[PDB]
């Protein structure tokens with residue numbers, strides 16, 4: 629659990645660094661600085677408006693943005709759902 | 719369960735009190751009274767348009783509103799998911 | 811499981827009957843007939859756009875509509891999450 | 901897990917093939933080719949704007965589209981939730 633939430637903090641920070649670089653200039657409100665990025669990626673992790681709100685408007689400028697976001701979702705969502713069911717049994 | 723759902727009820731009322739104060743005058747439709755607040759926070763707990771619908775339009779006036787909402791989400795969401803998985807086992 | 815999904819079918823049909831009556835005339839696209847109602851309530855059960863999309867536009871005509879929807883959500887969501895974790899162990 | 905995720909991959913490809921055919925010409929942005937379809941159906945599996953965003957605008961042209969989408973959701977959502985809860989236990 630302490631390890632799982634260590635992993636996910638690193639994945640979160642690394643993903644927000646990458647996204648700040650990738651989409652910062654084209655999507656300033658969502659990714660213009662690292663703080664805007666950790667927030668948006670938390671939102672994307674909660675699946676809230678991820679495609680209609682974030683990823684489709686992004687794909688109109690970066691057609692392959694799905695290569696970043698979908699695996700990100702798959703990893704954080706699985707890691708969160710592991711952290712939660714971990715803390716419980718623990 | 720009985721105690722978990724007591725904790726979550728208190729957290730819920732305290733959060734709705736706090737939010738009524740914090741965002742009530744700037745965001746009356748969502749937080750103008752305690753009843754509007756308990757509803758909106760139930761919605762935020764379900765994750766339904768929490769960011770594009772609530773929190774981003776709020777951060778345009780209160781840039782740190784994320785300090786309230788995100789931990790609220792993390793607490794309730796985890797506590798809810800624990801309450802439900804509790805009830806189930808508690809009948810096994 | 812067979813019992814749980816019997817309960818939830820009855821709750822679903824009863825809720826869609828009630829909603830067709832309550833919000834049918836004021837909200838025809840969402841509740842104008844029983845079929846429109848079972849669909850909308852499936853959507854509400856998945857939590858998709860439930861408040862910004864359905865319940866808030868409804869509360870502008872029926873202020874207490876939350877008395878119906880919130881318990882409905884609480885019941886179906888708990889029953890679904892019981893049916894799923896049931897089938898698994900079964 | 902290895903077999904569950906094989907099943908879900910096949911279901912996913914078959915569904916995206918079917919949807920490309922069914923809704924491709926009426927809804928090109930969402931289903932105009934198999935790649936647009938696999939993406940849109942991943943989104944529908946996450947429940948993200950599935951009804952207000954996808955399925956309701958689709959039912960305005962294909963009134964029975966719900967016969968495809970709802971069972972798709974029920975199948976993938978259940979299978980995904982089974983795959984994840986499988987992996988976890990499979991390492992206990």
Ligand SMILES: CCCCCCCCCC(=O)N(CCO)C[C@@H](O)[C@@H](O)[C@@H](O)[C@@H](O)CO
Pocket residue numbers: 640657663664665666667670774777778779781782784788
């Ligand atoms: C899992 C851990 C997730 C952690 C999430 C932390 C987010 C941090 C956000 C932050 O520090 N902000 C600055 C607050 O001063 C908010 C920014 O996102 C900001 O640039 C804008 O989004 C808004 O201010 C627009 O109104």
Ligand SMILES: CCCCCCCCCC(=O)N(CCO)C[C@@H](O)[C@@H](O)[C@@H](O)[C@@H](O)CO
Pocket residue numbers: 730753754755756757760866869870871873874876880
């Ligand atoms: C987990 C427990 C969550 C409990 C949630 C209780 C919500 C109570 C809402 C309520 O009592 N209202 C007043 C009913 O008279 C509705 C208000 O939220 C209202 O100000 C507006 O949202 C609408 O009327 C808009 O048209």
Ligand SMILES: CCCCCCCCCC(=O)N(CCO)C[C@@H](O)[C@@H](O)[C@@H](O)[C@@H](O)CO
Pocket residue numbers: 822839845846847848849852956959960961963964966970
């Ligand atoms: C858990 C079980 C959930 C079952 C859900 C079943 C929904 C049945 C919907 C149905 O039979 N329709 C008629 C199809 O002919 C669709 C209606 O909802 C319709 O009145 C409109 O919504 C659209 O046609 C608008 O374009």
Ligand SMILES: CCCCCCCCCC(=O)N(CCO)C[C@@H](O)[C@@H](O)[C@@H](O)[C@@H](O)CO
Pocket residue numbers: 684687688689691692694698912935936937938939942
């Ligand atoms: C579970 C596995 C899910 C796999 C999902 C794969 C999606 C593949 C998407 C893809 O290959 N695209 C082409 C990239 O060149 C993107 C398309 O969906 C595209 O037609 C549009 O959506 C955007 O380009 C809009 O601007």
Ligand SMILES: [Br-]
Pocket residue numbers: 763764798884887
């Ligand atoms: Br809930």
Ligand SMILES: [Br-]
Pocket residue numbers: 702705945946980
């Ligand atoms: Br997923």
